[PDB]
Amino acid sequence: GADGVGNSSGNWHCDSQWLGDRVITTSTRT
Amino acid sequence: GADGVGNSSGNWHCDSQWLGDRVITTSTRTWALPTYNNHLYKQISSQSGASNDNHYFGYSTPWGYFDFNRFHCHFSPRDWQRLINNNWGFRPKKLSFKLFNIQVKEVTQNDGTTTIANNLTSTVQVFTDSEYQLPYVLGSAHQGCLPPFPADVFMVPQYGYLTLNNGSQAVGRSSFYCLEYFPSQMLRTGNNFQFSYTFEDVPFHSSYAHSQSLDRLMNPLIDQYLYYLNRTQGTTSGTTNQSRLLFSQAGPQSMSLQARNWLPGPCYRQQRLSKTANDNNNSNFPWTAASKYHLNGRDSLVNPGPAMASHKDDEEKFFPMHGNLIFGKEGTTASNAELDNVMITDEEEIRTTNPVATEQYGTVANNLQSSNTAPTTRTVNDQGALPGMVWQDRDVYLQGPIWAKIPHTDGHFHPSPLMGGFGLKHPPPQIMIKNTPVPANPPTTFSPAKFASFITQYSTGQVSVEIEWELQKENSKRWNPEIQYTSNYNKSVNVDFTVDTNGVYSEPRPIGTRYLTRNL
Amino acid sequence: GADGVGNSSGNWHCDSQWLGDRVITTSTRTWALPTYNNHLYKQISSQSGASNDNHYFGYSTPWGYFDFNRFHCHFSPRDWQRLINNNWGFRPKKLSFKLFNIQVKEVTQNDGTTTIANNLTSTVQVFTDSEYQLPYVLGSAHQGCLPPFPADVFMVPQYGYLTLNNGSQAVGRSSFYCLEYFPSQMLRTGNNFQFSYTFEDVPFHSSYAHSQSLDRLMNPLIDQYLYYLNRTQGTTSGTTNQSRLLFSQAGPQSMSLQARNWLPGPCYRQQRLSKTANDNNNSNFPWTAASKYHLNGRDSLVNPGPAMASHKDDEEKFFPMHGNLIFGKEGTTASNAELDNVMITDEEEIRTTNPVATEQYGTVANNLQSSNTAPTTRTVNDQGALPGMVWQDRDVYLQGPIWAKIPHTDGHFHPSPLMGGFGLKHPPPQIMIKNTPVPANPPTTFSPAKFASFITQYSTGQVSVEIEWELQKENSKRWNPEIQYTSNYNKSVNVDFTVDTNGVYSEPRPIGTRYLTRNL
Amino acid sequence: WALPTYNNHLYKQISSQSGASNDNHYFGYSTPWGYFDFNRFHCHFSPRDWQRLINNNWGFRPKKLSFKLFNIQVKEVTQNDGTTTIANNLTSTVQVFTDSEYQLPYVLGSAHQGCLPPFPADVFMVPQYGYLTLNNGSQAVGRSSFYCLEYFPSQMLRTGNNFQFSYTFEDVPFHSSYAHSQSL
Amino acid sequence: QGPIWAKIPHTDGHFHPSPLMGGFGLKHPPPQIMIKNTPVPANPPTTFSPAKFASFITQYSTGQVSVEIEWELQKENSKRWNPEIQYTSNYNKSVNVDFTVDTNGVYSEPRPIGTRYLTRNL
Numbered sequence A: 001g002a003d004g005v006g007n008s009s010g011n012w013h014c015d016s017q018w019l020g021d022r023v024i025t026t027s028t029r030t
Numbered sequence B, C: 001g002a003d004g005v006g007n008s009s010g011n012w013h014c015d016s017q018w019l020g021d022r023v024i025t026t027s028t029r030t031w032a033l034p035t036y037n038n039h040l041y042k043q044i045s046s047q048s049g050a051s052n053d054n055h056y057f058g059y060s061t062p063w064g065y066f067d068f069n070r071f072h073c074h075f076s077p078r079d080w081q082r083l084i085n086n087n088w089g090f091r092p093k094k095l096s097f098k099l100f101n102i103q104v105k106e107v108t109q110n111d112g113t114t115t116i117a118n119n120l121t122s123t124v125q126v127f128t129d130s131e132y133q134l135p136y137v138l139g140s141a142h143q144g145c146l147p148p149f150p151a152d153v154f155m156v157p158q159y160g161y162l163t164l165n166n167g168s169q170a171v172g173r174s175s176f177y178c179l180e181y182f183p184s185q186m187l188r189t190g191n192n193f194q195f196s197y198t199f200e201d202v203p204f205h206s207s208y209a210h211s212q213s214l215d216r217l218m219n220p221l222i223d224q225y226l227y228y229l230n231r232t233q234g235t236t237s238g239t240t241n242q243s244r245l246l247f248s249q250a251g252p253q254s255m256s257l258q259a260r261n262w263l264p265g266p267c268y269r270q271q272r273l274s275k276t277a278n279d280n281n282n283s284n285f286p287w288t289a290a291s292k293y294h295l296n297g298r299d300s301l302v303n304p305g306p307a308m309a310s311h312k313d314d315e316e317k318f319f320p321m322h323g324n325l326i327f328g329k330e331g332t333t334a335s336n337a338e339l340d341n342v343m344i345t346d347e348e349e350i351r352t353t354n355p356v357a358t359e360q361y362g363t364v365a366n367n368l369q370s371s372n373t374a375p376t377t378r379t380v381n382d383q384g385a386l387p388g389m390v391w392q393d394r395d396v397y398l399q400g401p402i403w404a405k406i407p408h409t410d411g412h413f414h415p416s417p418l419m420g421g422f423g424l425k426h427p428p429p430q431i432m433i434k435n436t437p438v439p440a441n442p443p444t445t446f447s448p449a450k451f452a453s454f455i456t457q458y459s460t461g462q463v464s465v466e467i468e469w470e471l472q473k474e475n476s477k478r479w480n481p482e483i484q485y486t487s488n489y490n491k492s493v494n495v496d497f498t499v500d501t502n503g504v505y506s507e508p509r510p511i512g513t514r515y516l517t518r519n520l
Numbered sequence D: 001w002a003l004p005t006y007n008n009h010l011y012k013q014i015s016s017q018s019g020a021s022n023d024n025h026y027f028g029y030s031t032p033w034g035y036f037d038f039n040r041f042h043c044h045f046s047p048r049d050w051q052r053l054i055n056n057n058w059g060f061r062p063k064k065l066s067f068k069l070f071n072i073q074v075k076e077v078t079q080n081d082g083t084t085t086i087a088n089n090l091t092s093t094v095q096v097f098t099d100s101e102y103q104l105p106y107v108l109g110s111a112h113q114g115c116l117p118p119f120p121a122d123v124f125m126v127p128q129y130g131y132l133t134l135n136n137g138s139q140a141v142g143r144s145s146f147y148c149l150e151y152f153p154s155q156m157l158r159t160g161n162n163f164q165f166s167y168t169f170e171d172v173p174f175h176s177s178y179a180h181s182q183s184l
Numbered sequence E: 001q002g003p004i005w006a007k008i009p010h011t012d013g014h015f016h017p018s019p020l021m022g023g024f025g026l027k028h029p030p031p032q033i034m035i036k037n038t039p040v041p042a043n044p045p046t047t048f049s050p051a052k053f054a055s056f057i058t059q060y061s062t063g064q065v066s067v068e069i070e071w072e073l074q075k076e077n078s079k080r081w082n083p084e085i086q087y088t089s090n091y092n093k094s095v096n097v098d099f100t101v102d103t104n105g106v107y108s109e110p111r112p113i114g115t116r117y118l119t120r121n122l
């Protein structure tokens, strides 16, 4: 990825939901 | 390439992998560049009566330059080991030069505090002397190369050149060069510089040492069918036996008398020195007794002369007066350092093809012997070239020079860099660099006077050099093991080729290249 | 090829015919091979304190080898005549090696009678060093070549090689070679061996001699337009005539003073010897007064040095101290033979391009002459190479060496075999041969001990070598007849180049190659 | 290689000496057969090769195999008076076979001698085959096994005959031609 | 000069089936190759004998043998900066040459040779 100065290079993804068969854990920290 | 402010114009490429047939060395370092000569070209020259053999005339340029004419710039200690211990020979092939991540910081001394900030709108200028129109100042063992250790930062050297001179003065045929009269690419932050070069055909280096000798080349078991004269008088000496011409058939017994097909390499005798500071003469002779040449009535020391052996067997203490390259250990003043502070290189692998540097060359006749005259012998101290001579060149060490620009003259003999390496007609061109001058504050009234008030600023960024190396694999039917370079497995203080307690990389010893054996 | 017991695996091909443009020499001889070193590799070395310049270290191998590095191996006396008297020059082109009609005889000493019989189920082993991994021991004037006379039988020599050594001892960089670690073809009776080789590009030999001279190259009738200085003082000497600078225009009169474009070949002075055992000094100086070189602190005699002329005009009795190849007559001990038992070769055709071996080289200045100082002259005894020098190489004789393996070093000058012939990077590889060891009777109980009880046996058979030769025809506008080699038509005792009363071939004299004249 | 006639063309029952040792008791047989072995690295690698190998590779392993017997000669000896004469018995044969079904006791991999000489120029004597079986002291049990190598199909060779054999190693982990720079 | 392989015994269980003396543990290792001289009856009697034959002509066999083995290699991939230790011959002035025949033709292996000279991490 390649962008600029006043443009965030990512979002705050921190969440977890279940699939009954599996689970996805998303974590974001500073 | 063209991008923006908050976008890196390059990545950190520093690695090396092998192809068995060849090896690619990628190296990246961080560099810093000041403003040299205050944005000015200056005429430099020899001090008014300060020295005679050191007279000179030239100029100092506001430009800096990049250099990596050292093997340790590209190979790591380990890689160099693999290379040395496995290959008959090797050579340079391709080249990739890259400049990126440029930042121009301008500094201001306000009160008693130096503040440094970003001057984004400022540029830097690069160009490569590919037409070879600027004096080639590389291949002279100068400093300012790329750091052996990748983590180290370096300062970009300044460009200065010499010209024809008559003492402290110059001749009308001298030449003044302005690097501003060269088209150069100017770069802002986010701009990068690209360059690709292709090495010419140049003979592999000798990463080998001969297991045979010049005089020990024949068959130990069979006798020659040729005859030589070995007795001029000594007969059945008793009665009436003055003299008689007697010839012998060469045998394994007459080993140093047999007919020969080849001669040793040329020579230029060097003075013998001992490392023991008491074997030597109690006199200062590093100039009045050393071998030197002179041009235009100017003495110059013949430092790395023709390739000659350092010492004969069973000595290993007598080195030639500057008969080899000497490297200075890390942290050691440039002025009169101790013997235990330098690393002297031993050229004892070329004993079989080359004459000993300090020893003589041989015997020559110089009279018409007869009943009236006794035969005379002359000790030859200097030998030009001869039909039938065969020699091995010097050696390259992990920290030695790589290439050298063969001078553009009417004639050359065996154009191999005396300091060692690859002699190139057209070597990796010079890459120049300089901070674009920024005028400080100008007056509201017009001034014809030369501008000399500039904003103080320095540049910084990364540089990347990729080189491909062709390899010559080893094909020997030697039964017993050959000698290999290795680290001392013993319990040790510091680790060879490593940083210390306060972060300083240090190269313990010089590294030869000749560990593998090939015949004659 | 693969056939049976009662079927010859080859024919006797020995003949030579001419193509006017080239000549093919076919040669076949009968060979015999013993069991060398008792099926063992032995470490050989110099005697514990027997000699100093003759120290050595190497090994003795159970293998034999084939050699034909002598011209008389291929050319007959007559052919050599045609060749010499007709061609400007010549060279090697192709090669065909063939082994056949092999028979393995095993011998047993029963009581007081040696019985010899056939061991059909026994084999012999051949292989050719084409990768040049075994020390090249050929081109050293060794004996064991093919017999000059076709009817003669020869013994196949033994292979022995030398290595790097430190006196009587060896270095860790020395090399041990086992010829068993080479893939070899094993042959039973009815098997044969085949091999084809192709010579590289190598300059024709000089089967000619110059009719002009270096200094006698200009025009006898016209004067030069160049000027030289010939008078420094001698003026109209009488009144007030101390000195004056006077120049003359070169004329046919000032023949040895005219401007020159070229120089003679290099030189390395040799001592002058007389064939008359009374002209000489009453002292034994064949080592203490002879020209020699030294490597690694080891003296070696410079036998066939640079190509220099043997004697000046009107002498023909003074030969250089080993300044040429000397051949031994048939039937003459290897230890101190008489002067009337050897054949010394005269190099008196190269007088026009080469300096005299025993004589000096010339005059050199070595001071700044003036009113205060008298001009000084130095007799030059040793001259390296120089821009503008031109020389002729040595000569090849009917019984001289043919080729020589140019050593694999970093550098060579004028890589022509000092003993004469064709210098080859890749010369006709070495062909090895040895009788496959046959275990004698073994014990019913197992023994880990090295086996050393073998059946005694020797091999025999024929060998064939075919060589093609490219020729350089003669194109001269010489009006008068040139000199030709010829036999003495006079009533004679024995016939030149022939067997005697009890069957022994003998080569009367050495045969030069330079009988035809070409200009400069 | 050289091969004698072992056990005088006879299979012999061997066993422990009647009360000579206790932890060394044994029972087996001695066969008239010899065998080939090269279960030593120096049989294949030269000193130099071994160096290249060692100094360059993380690890290594065996893959394929090619066995060949040739140039066979059968010499018969006769002691006439006080002189041993040796000659050629062309019409005589030799017998080879390979235990590929692994039915004969595997006697290799026991550090025995008789391998191929480290040095190529050296000649060696072909060892003799002998095997052991279940034993109760100096005696044997009923469950012991007697093997006759003659009950195996074997190829007989005259002079000019040769023997051929190809084998393929199974999957076996590389050897550690390395040493750890870290510790546990 | 060490062993190469070893036949893993055919039992109900093994743990870490590596030859204790070192090398490659093989379920099915290079089979055994047998050799023997075919018995040749000496001179027989004109009268028939049921007795076991034990009079043979004394004879021995000889010839060549060839063994070709292919070896898979695992190359070295280390980012070690400083040099590693290597096996080498003593470059010093020496008596006899390591791994060589002597004055009367006897090959001799000076020292044992390890295999572990290169370093890898954990």
Ligand SMILES: Nc1ncnc2c1ncn2[C@H]1C[C@H](O)[C@@H](COP(=O)(O)O)O1
Pocket: B202, B203, B412, B413, B414, B415, B416, B417, B421, B422, B423, B424, C410
């Ligand atoms: N480093 C290097 N570069 C180029 N040539 C080398 C070098 N070292 C040795 N030589 C030799 C190889 C050629 O035979 C010869 C050409 O010389 P010339 O004067 O060009 O005819 O110079």
Ligand SMILES: Nc1ncnc2c1ncn2[C@H]1C[C@H](O)[C@@H](COP(=O)(O)O)O1
Pocket: C202, C203, C412, C413, C414, C415, C416, C417, C421, C422, C423, C424
């Ligand atoms: N016998 C023989 N073989 C090869 N070359 C010869 C010989 N005799 C003379 N020369 C000359 C011919 C080439 O001009 C030169 C090449 O030298 P180089 O050092 O190869 O550049 O050497």
Ligand SMILES: Nc1ncnc2c1ncn2[C@H]1C[C@H](O)[C@@H](COP(=O)(O)O)O1
Pocket: D172, D173, E014, E015, E016, E017, E018, E019, E023, E024, E025, E026
């Ligand atoms: N030389 C040798 N041969 C085979 N396996 C080896 C060897 N050395 C170590 N191992 C290990 C590798 C497998 O993970 C394990 C299988 O054991 P198992 O009992 O087979 O389940 O044994």
